[PDB]
Write a protein that binds this ligand. Sequence first.
Ligand code: CL
Ligand code: CL
Ligand code: NA
Ligand code: NA
Ligand code: NA
Lengths: 318, 320
Amino acid sequence: MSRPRILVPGKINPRVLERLPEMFETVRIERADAALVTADMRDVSGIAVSGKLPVPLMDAFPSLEIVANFGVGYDGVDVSRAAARGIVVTNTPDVLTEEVADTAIGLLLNTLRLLPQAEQWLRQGRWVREGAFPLSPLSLRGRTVGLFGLGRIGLAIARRLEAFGVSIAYHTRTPREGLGFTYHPTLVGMAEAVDTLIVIVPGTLKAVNADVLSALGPKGVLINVGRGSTVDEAALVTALQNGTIAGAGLDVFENEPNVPEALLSFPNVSLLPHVASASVVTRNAMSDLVVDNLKAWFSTGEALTPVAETPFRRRAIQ
Amino acid sequence: RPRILVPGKINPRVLERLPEMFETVRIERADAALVTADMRDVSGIAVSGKLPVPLMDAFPSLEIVANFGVGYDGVDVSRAAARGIVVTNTPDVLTEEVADTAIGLLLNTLRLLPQAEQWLRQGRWVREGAFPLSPLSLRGRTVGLFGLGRIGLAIARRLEAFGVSIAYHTRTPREGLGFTYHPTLVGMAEAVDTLIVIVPGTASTLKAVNADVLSALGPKGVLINVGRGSTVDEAALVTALQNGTIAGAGLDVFENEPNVPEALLSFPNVSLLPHVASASVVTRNAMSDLVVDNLKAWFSTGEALTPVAETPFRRRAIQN
Ligand SMILES: [Cl-]
Ligand SMILES: [Cl-]
Ligand code: NA
Ligand code: NA
Ligand code: NA
């Protein structure tokens, strides 16, 4: 049994490790580091990876055909270099869409209604000793929501928001035919028109800058759920400090896991440690898609979810 | 001008607007001992919470009690009805806000968002790494509503957009709705994994969510209570959580508020809120406006806006 050999560098969801033996021999190295590649490993034809895949590691495998990335985001893979070598890169879209949309709505409600702070009030004994938690100055009722980015996650968020009875707008570079939402050709224009901005664009130039936050306005609320941040964190802190905007909810940050100290001090801010897809069920589905991409490639010659930059079918082997 | 008693604490918007038509009479607590002789010309009450019968019966010219809240358990409505006194509540203006809170509480219970936030704020994301993956999720869940009404329909509307199936239990089915009806609470709890309690709290629904219901809900079961605390058998809930009979709970209401038993505070799979279902400034302002506009409508048009079912009275001797 000469089964294809798949490298796994460093940590990965254990479900990937569990399922690879269905078709593959797994080659483990402790870190994503070309120094750890031995001569025997040079027949490796696939990689399964979560996070950074340095180019020297990728280029240590002359027979490499496919990189199966864990996550919808694949920033850690040099896709231009992969494309140049005819290497297919796959990601995990679709299976996490609904879970991410759920998290975004949860974060929005927690930011507006202060539910985590209400719970802390109760757990600190203050309901007993001091009385009712103060009324939340904000609410979802009567708000107008602007989506920066659409895609499948944006459509899923928009679908939820319609059912809460809020008006919905969106900004993308091109409008979507068919949708009954208001399209804004510019980000600043949309931020002007709405009081609630939800950032779902993947996110070096931070598009949500001082000008955008100022347009959002004094009743404005910013929600960021990304794979990276396109929010100018220093500009956000300044806006919150000065009352330029009314509140914010953030699941993603410029330099995770580090959150600037100033953001932790505001009473009108909700902070989450990048939990958008972090359920057992959804991370299991992401793991399954990594493995099923590899299985499709080696049993049929085409991947399930290849990225846009690598539209390749499997080549002949001599 | 008609004189309106306000006993104890009430949203300041009520106090602000009463002078549009009324003289306000304030007493520090809802206690008949605080009523003086010159207050006996009072013709209306605006009240939040309990209105003891001796306080209500201290006012021989009382015509109307405008209750702050959709619930009016604190008013003895049968005694009011016997005296020809109209009681009003504040329905409709809080429905969407309450539905929002229910969905927020559900998501927080399933995905552990408040605990995730505490993990971050305690410095544990930095020092220890990722918050654990949540064992539960809204994905693939089946939701059973105990009670329907306008709040239940608003919750159902939200849940449809999350791609979860909806079932409901009430004493009689509703014609027209495309939700699955369950004739019994235990039967629904068997069929679903998520039970949301919204039913109007009555003597009939008291401790209806009992050991049998929670056991039927099952080991992936989650209980959300945004109705009355007394609809859930609190001791039975604690036992079920302790033993893993159910997987989690989210509670905005309790048997003896503001007291929450110590055992409930210890569970890592439980979200607890201090009765905040309608507690935004915008929604409590709308509730305040409806209290005052009920009083204004009574005295200036001869009928109330939102009289309760037990006191379907219009004001006598008015050319309206
Ligand atoms: Cl994972
Ligand atoms: Cl209030
Ligand atoms: Na704006
Ligand atoms: Na069940
Ligand atoms: Na309630």
